[PDB]
Structures are given as structure tokens and as C-alpha cells.
Write a protein that binds this ligand. Structure first.
Ligand SMILES: O=[N+]([O-])c1ccc(O[C@H]2O[C@H](CO)[C@@H](O)[C@H](O)[C@@H]2O)cc1
Length: 153
């Protein structure tokens, strides 16, 4: 009746594991920058969608908004940042993250790390954030481990 979800966000590496199986892993240098998004079925944990939005670059946040608005309210939503996800995370995307209940997403800053697990229509199940301490530095790697409830009946 529960999914064991692990989410890792850092300068050079992201991964997501569900029930001990890696469903997303990107450790490639110079690739996969931005916010990675995984959508899971809320009864089985099966992956319904996997995306990466390079929100360090213009226009990617608009694509993230259009994608997230089509996710059904019951789904499990997982986000994790690789390298930099804030430079072009603009106000409409931040407001959408705030509407999910995210505390750190709407405040994401330069080279911060961020891992998030929650139900599309609320509530948030787990969230971790590390603020970069200097423009030349990154946030500390964050490893979020969250038990996500499953729907049934
Ligand atoms: O020449 N520039 O305008 C310029 C130089 C460096 C820069 O930041 C560096 O950090 C980014 C975010 O961490 C990385 O994604 C890039 O690989 C980049 O090398 C951004 C712009």
C-alpha cells in the first residue's frame, strides 16, 4: 500500500528509484541540465511519463507548465534538479509549483539542489532543498527518501 521512492539531486547527477528499481538515472557530464519530472500511476507506481526541462534556458519553463497542467490530479509527481534549474524558471512555473504545495520549488535559486515527491492535486509527501552558498558553488547533494501512499479499492 506504499511506494518506496528515492530522489537524488546534485550538480552532476540525478536519479529516481521506485521500490528499489532505478527509473531515472543521469550522470552524464554536460547533459540533462534542468528539472527532471517523473509521473507515476498512483495505484501501481508504473511510470506514466518522464521529461527533462532545461529551465536554465528560456522557454523550457513554458513547456513544463503546459506538460504539468495535463497531468491528472491523482498522479504521483517527482521532480529533481541537475546542475541548474532556476535561471529561466519564471513566475508562471513558480506559481504552478506553489499550487502543488512545493515550498522550495517556487523559491529555487542559482545552482540550488531540489528533490520533490507529491500528489499532483496535493499533498506533498517529501521535499528537500539545498541553497547554493555562492555563485561559483552548487547546493549540497540531496537524497530524499519518501514513503508514498498508494490508492486502492
Ligand atoms: O559565457 N556565459 O554567459 C556563461 C558562462 C558560464 C555559465 O555557467 C556555467 O554554469 C551553468 C549553470 O551551472 C552550466 O550549466 C554551464 O555549463 C555553464 O558553463 C553561464 C553562462
Amino acid at each position: 500500500r506504499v511506494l518506496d521512492v528515492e530522489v537524488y539531486s546534485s550538480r552532476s547527477k540525478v536519479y529516481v528509484a521506485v521500490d528499489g528499481t532505478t527509473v531515472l538515472e543521469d550522470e552524464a557530464r554536460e547533459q540533462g541540465r534542468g528539472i527532471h519530472v517523473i509521473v507515476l500511476n498512483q495505484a501501481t507506481g508504473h511510470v506514466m511519463a518522464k521529461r527533462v526541462f532545461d529551465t536554465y534556458s528560456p522557454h523550457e519553463d513554458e513547456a513544463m507548465v503546459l506538460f504539468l497542467n495535463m497531468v491528472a490530479p491523482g498522479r504521483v509527481l517527482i521532480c529533481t534538479v541537475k546542475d541548474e534549474g532556476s535561471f529561466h524558471l519564471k513566475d508562471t512555473a513558480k506559481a504552478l509549483l506553489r499550487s502543488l504545495g512545493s515550498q522550495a520549488g517556487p523559491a529555487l535559486g542559482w545552482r540550488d539542489t531540489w528533490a520533490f515527491v507529491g500528489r499532483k492535486g496535493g499533498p506533498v509527501f517529501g521535499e528537500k532543498h539545498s541553497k547554493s552558498p555562492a555563485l561559483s558553488s552548487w547546493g549540497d547533494p540531496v537524497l530524499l527518501k519518501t514513503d508514498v501512499p498508494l490508492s486502492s479499492a
